[PDB]
Design a protein around this ligand. Structure first.
Ligand code: ZN
Lengths: 101, 132, 314
RNA sequence: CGUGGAGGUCAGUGACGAAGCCUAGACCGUAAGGUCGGGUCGAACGGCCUCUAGUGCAGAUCUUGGUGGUAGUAGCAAAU
RNA sequence: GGACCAAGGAGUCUAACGUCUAUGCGAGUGUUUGGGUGUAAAACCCAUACGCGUAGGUUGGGGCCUCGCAAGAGGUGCACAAUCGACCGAUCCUGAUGUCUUCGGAUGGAUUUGAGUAAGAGCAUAGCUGUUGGGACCCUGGUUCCUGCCGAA
RNA sequence: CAACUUUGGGGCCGUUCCUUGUCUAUGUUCCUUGGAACAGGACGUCAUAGAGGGUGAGAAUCCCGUGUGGCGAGGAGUGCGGUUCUUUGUAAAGUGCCUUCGAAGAGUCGAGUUGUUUUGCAGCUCUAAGUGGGUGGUAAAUUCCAUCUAAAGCUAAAUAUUGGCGAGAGACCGAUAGCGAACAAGUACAGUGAUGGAAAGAUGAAAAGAACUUUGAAAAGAGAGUGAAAAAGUACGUGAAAUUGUUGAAAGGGAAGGGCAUUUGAUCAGACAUGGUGUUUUGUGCCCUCUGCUCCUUGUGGGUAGGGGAAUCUCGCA
C-alpha cells in the first residue's frame, strides 16, 4: 500500500509538505530525517524508518517497523544514544544492521 | 502517439511503472507491446467478448497458451461450452468472471501475469474488434 | 491487512473481544474518482443567485446593464452515476483505515490505541457532553480536538459578512449503529461529526476531497459495516451492488519488481547514473597523448622521422 | 503568472501592527510576476491541494469622476 | 484615434446534434418525476415504469512457441486488409409440382447490392472542443496576462 | 313480508389551534502587551447551550441570547376525550325477499353559409327524435358489437404566484457594484403636462468637537489644550495618479524623449562573524560502583530514585 500512500501524498495533498520558491518540497513531518518531501523522505510513505531526534537533552534513535503499522501510539521505538560520538555512530550502525544505506 | 497514459487511475500508473521496468529490462518484444497497449484510450481499448475468446481458443496449439486482454473481458450468453483456461486482463465483468471461474478456469490480473510470464512465455493477446 | 481489530473500552484499553475487518477496507483507493465525485457532490448544496432582469445601456457604462446578466438557469446541481458515487464512498472508507493518510491530511492521531479505532457500543448510550469528551480523552483523540479548538480563525474573504464568519479544522468522525443520545452529546464539541453507518456522507468522509479523515467507530457500527457494504460472504444490503474489484492484486510494485523471479528474469543493470565519456574533445596533431591513444604507428613514425626522410640518389 | 469567492490544510500570519499606500531600498524570476527592508497605516489576511467565475485594458471621437493648458485670456447680465 | 489621470469596460449563459478524452458498469446501462430517510434545499436508501443499446479458405500480420551461438528457419497467428467463397434481402430471366384460367413459384442462372449473417458495445456522468439557434464578444470601430512549441495561404 | 340494526340535542372541563407572558448552564481566575483585553501565555468550569450579536480589538464561560425543558395568560374551536343535563313521536333510516309501478335539460341537437381559429367558437338562415340520441371501430356484409347520456348546478386536495403579510437562507454585489435610491430617493431638480430623474456611506472608544490668551471687519490664524492617534479638527478612516506651490540640486537657452556602456557627484548596503583540531589542569554530572523504583512496543528497550567515589580508570560537560 506504500506506493499507493506515496502517490496520494505526492500527487495530492501531503499536509506536511511545504513548497519552496525554487520548486523543491519540504515535509514538516517531525520524524523526517532530511527536510525534503521525497519518496524516501516521507515517514508516512515508508514503514521501515529511522530518525535521530532529541528529547529535551538526550538524543534518541527512533525506529519504525512495518510490524506496527497499526497501533501508532506504540509505533516508534526509542534508543538512547551515547554521548560518545564514535560510540553513538557505532550504535547507529548496530541497530541499522542489514538496513539500507 | 501517447507516451504516457492520459488516464489518472493510480493502479493503472502502477502497472505502467511495472511494465516500463519490464520493457526496459527485458529483451522480449512482449512487454513493449503491453506498454504500448496500456496507453490506449477507451475507444482504443474495445471490449473483448468471452465468445471471441473461446473462438480464439479454437486455434491450433493454443489450448495450453494463456490469453491476455489489455481491456475488459465481457460476457456473452450466446456460448455454452467454455474451456478451462487462464485469462489475464485489466477488468472482468462479473458475468464473464463467473464464466471463467465456472468453467474451472482462472481470472488473472496483469501483475500476476507479469509474475507468471516475465518474458511472455506461451501467451496470447487478443484485441476487440473495433468498428467505431 | 490484519484479520481483526481489538475493540476498546470507554475507559480506553484493549477489550478482550476483537472484530474481523468488514473487507470494505480492502477496497481500491481511487483519489481521482473521489475528486471527480467530490466536486459534483460539493456542488449540490448551492443556492442560485442572479442580477435583476432589466435593472447608459452599456457594459462599459457607469450604471448601465452589465455584460452577461447572470441568469438563474445556469446549471447548479450535477448528476452523478450512483455506482460511481458509491465507489468514491468505498474508497474513502478504505482510506480511513490506513492512517498514514490520516496523518497525511493532518490529524493528531499519533497517540491513539490502533487503527481503525473501535470503541464499544456503550459509547452510544452516553447522553452528556462532558462524559463523551472525557471518553475521547480516554481514547487519545484529545490532541486532535485541541487542534480543532485552537484552529478557529476568521474568514479572510468578504464572505465573513455573508454569514460564513469563522473557520476551523475538522476532527474526529464518530460512526454509530444507533443513536442513544450520543449525537446530542457530541453536538456541542467542535470538530466532531457523527454519522449513521447507512448514510456515511462523503463530504464528511473526505473533506476537501482529501482521503482519510480520522474516523472513530462504535463496536456495533463496525460489525454493521459488513451489513452495509457486503462482502464475499455477506451479500450487500444494497440492490445489485458489489464491492468493486482491483485491477492489480499486490499494492506494492517495488515488491513485485524486487521479488525473486523478476529478479531472476532480468538482465543486469547499469550504473544508475551515466558514466560520461568524452566530455571534451582533445585534438590530435598536438596533445601527443591523445595522438597515442590513436595510431600507435605514430610513435615509431616520429622515432624514425619519416617526415624528413632523405630519398635515394638513384 | 495574476483577481473575487468556495472545500480541505498549514493547531499559517496579525494591535509588539493584518490589508492597503509610498519607496532615486535590496533580492529572485526569461517574463507574466513574486519576496523582503524602510516609511505610512490602522483590523484583518496569506501559502499549499482542489473548485468556481461578473477573472487580467491604452486605446472602442467608450462610461463616470478628477485635473491641466488655452489664460488672468476672451470678456464684464456669457452663472452670481 | 488621441489634453492627462483614476476606476469601470467587451467570446458569457443555455438548448440541440458531433468528435475526442477520462470515469463507472457492461449486453446492458441510466438513483434524485417521485417515495422512504435525515444531523434537513446536503447526504443516504429505492418500488413500478420509462429512455437508449443489445438480441469458410488463402495470403499476410502484432506477437508467442520451437530449433538455431547468433544470423536465420519452422509452427501457431491479435487487430486489420486483399482474394476466393457461402448464405440472406434485392435485381432480371427460367416458370416445374401443381393448376378454379389466371393462380403459383420449384429449380437453375445473372450482376452489383448491404456501416447484411458468418459470435456484440453500448449506456450514463464529467471535461475540452465542432455546427446551429437564442441579444450570443461589445458599440464601421474596438475587443484586457506571460513564455515555449508548431505554423500556411 | 321477515327480521334485525340505528338514533338526536345540548352544557361544562380538558385536549387541539392561535396570540402572548415568564423561568430555565459555566471564569470576568493570575501574567504580558495595549488608551481600552474580547489579544498572547498559565490554570479552570459548562455543554441537549462552541448559532448569532453587543460590550473601548478574534468573548462558550461579561451581557443578551442559544439549548433543554417548565410555568402561565387571553382567545378560536368542535377536531375528539371525559363528565353532566336532557332527549319518543306510533319519529326517522338502513339491509334482504315478494308484489305493483317505474316520468327527465328544444331555437337546443343537427344543416347550410359567413367570419374567426386550426377543429371549435360566433353571427345569419333553417331547424329535430324518443326501444331516443351522441361517439368509435367492425364486416364472410338488407353488418354486428362497443361506449356514454348532451343541451341545468356545486365540489376540497395535489397547481400557478416578479403583488400583499411575514419568516429563513445565499460558492451573489461591497458604495461608478448591488434596486434609480445603503444618505430626509422617486428626493433635489427638469418639463405646461404626460413624464424624466440625479449626486450623496466611514471623526473618535468616548465629543473627550479644541477652556483660556492674542491677531483678526469678518473669514481665517497663532499661542495653548483634549485625545493612544488631530501623520483622527464636524473640510474629518485610509488617503494613489493626473495636476499645483515652495525649497534644494542639476541642465538649458528658442533645449524633445529612450537604449547601451562608463566615469563624476550624491548616496546606500556591506558580520550582533569571531571558530575548529589535538594536548594538558582542576571540578562536576545521566562518569564509575553499590542499592532501587517504574512503563510497555517484552527488546539490540524507555523513564526514574538513594548513598558512595574520580584515591585509580573512563565518557560528557565546565
Ligand atoms: Zn510529505
Amino acid at each position: 500500500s506504500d506506493e499507493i500512500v506515496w502517490q496520494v501524498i505526492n500527487q495530492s495533498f501531503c499536509s506536511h509538505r511545504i513548497k519552496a520558491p525554487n520548486g523543491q518540497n519540504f515535509c514538516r513531518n517531525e520524524y523526517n530525517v532530511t527536510g525534503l518531501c521525497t519518496r524516501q523522505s516521507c515517514p508516512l510513505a515508508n514503514s521501515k524508518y529511522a530518525t535521530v531526534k532529541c528529547d529535551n537533552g538526550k538524543l534518541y534513535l527512533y525506529m519504525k517497523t512495518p510490524e506496527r503499522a497499526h497501533t501508532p501510539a506504540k509505533l516508534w521505538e526509542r534508543i538512547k544514544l551515547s554521548k560518545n560520538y564514535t560510540k553513538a555512530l557505532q550504535q547507529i550502525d548496530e541497530h541499522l544492521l542489514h538496513w539500507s544505506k | 502517439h501517447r507516451t504516457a497514459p492520459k488516464s489518472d487511475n493510480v493502479y493503472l500508473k502502477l502497472l505502467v511503472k511495472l511494465y516500463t521496468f519490464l520493457a526496459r529490462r527485458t529483451d522480449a518484444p512482449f512487454n513493449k507491446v503491453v506498454l504500448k497497449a496500456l496507453f490506449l484510450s477507451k475507444i482504443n481499448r474495445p471490449p473483448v467478448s468471452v465468445s471471441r475468446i473461446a473462438r480464439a481458443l479454437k486455434q491450433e496449439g493454443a489450448a495450453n497458451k494463456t490469453v491476455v486482454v489489455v481491456g475488459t473481458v465481457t460476457d456473452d450468453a450466446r456460448i455454452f461450452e467454455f474451456p478451462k483456461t487462464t485469462v489475464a486482463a485489466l477488468r472482468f465483468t462479473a458475468g464473464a468472471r463467473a464464466k471463467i471461474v465456472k468453467a474451472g478456469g482462472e481470472c488473472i490480473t496483469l501483475d500476476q501475469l507479469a509474475v507468471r510470464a516475465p518474458k511472455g512465455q506461451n501467451t496470447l493477446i487478443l484485441r476487440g474488434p473495433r468498428n467505431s | 491487512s490484519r484479520p481483526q481489530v481489538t475493540v476498546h473500552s470507554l475507559t480506553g484499553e484493549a477489550t478482550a473481544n476483537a472484530l474481523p475487518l468488514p473487507a470494505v477496507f480492502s477496497a481500491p483507493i481511487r483519489p481521482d474518482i473521489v475528486h471527480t465525485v467530490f466536486t459534483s457532490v460539493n456542488k449540490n448544496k448551492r443556492q442560485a443567485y442572479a442580477v435583476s432582469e432589466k435593472a447608459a445601456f452599456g457594459n462599459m457604462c457607469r450604471g448601465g446593464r452589465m455584460f452577461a446578466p447572470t441568469k438563474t438557469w445556469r446549471k447548479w446541481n450535477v448528476k452523478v452515476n450512483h455506482n460511481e458515487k458509491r465507489y468514491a464512498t468505498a474508497s474513502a472508507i478504505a482510506a480511513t483505515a490506513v492512517a498514514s493518510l490520516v496523518l497525511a491530511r493532518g490529524h493528531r492521531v499519533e497517540k491513539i490505541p490502533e487503527i481503525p479505532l473501535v470503541v464499544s457500543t456503550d459509547l452510544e448510550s452516553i447522553q452528556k457532553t462532558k462524559e463523551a469528551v472525557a471518553a475521547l480523552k480516554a481514547v487519545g483523540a484529545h490532541s486532535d480536538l485541541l487542534k480543532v479548538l485552537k484552529s478557529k480563525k476568521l474568514r479572510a474573504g468578504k464572505g465573513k459578512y455573508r454569514n460564513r464568519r469563522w473557520t476551523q479544522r475538522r476532527g474526529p468522525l464518530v460512526v454509530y449503529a444507533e443513536d442513544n443520545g450520543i449525537v446530542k452529546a457530541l453536538r456541542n464539541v467542535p470538530g466532531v461529526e457523527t454519522a449513521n453507518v447507512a448514510s456515511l456522507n462523503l463530504l464528511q468522509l473526505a473533506p476537501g476531497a482529501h482521503l482519510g479523515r480520522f474516523v472513530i467507530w462504535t463496536e456495533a457500527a463496525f460489525t454493521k459495516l459488513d451489513q452495509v457494504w457486503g462482502s464475499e460472504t455477506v451479500a450487500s444490503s444494497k440492490v445489485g451492488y458489489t464491492l468493486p474489484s482491483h485491477i492489480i492484486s499486490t499494492s506494492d510494485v517495488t515488491r513485485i519488481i524486487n521479488s525473486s523471479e523478476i529478479q531472476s528474469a532480468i538482465r543486469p543493470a547499469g550504473q544508475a547514473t551515466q558514466k560520461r565519456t568524452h566530455v571534451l574533445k582533445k585534438n590530435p596533431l598536438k596533445n601527443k597523448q591523445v595522438l597515442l591513444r590513436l595510431n600507435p604507428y605514430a610513435k615509431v613514425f616520429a622515432a624514425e622521422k619519416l617526415g624528413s626522410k632523405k630519398a635515394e640518389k638513384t
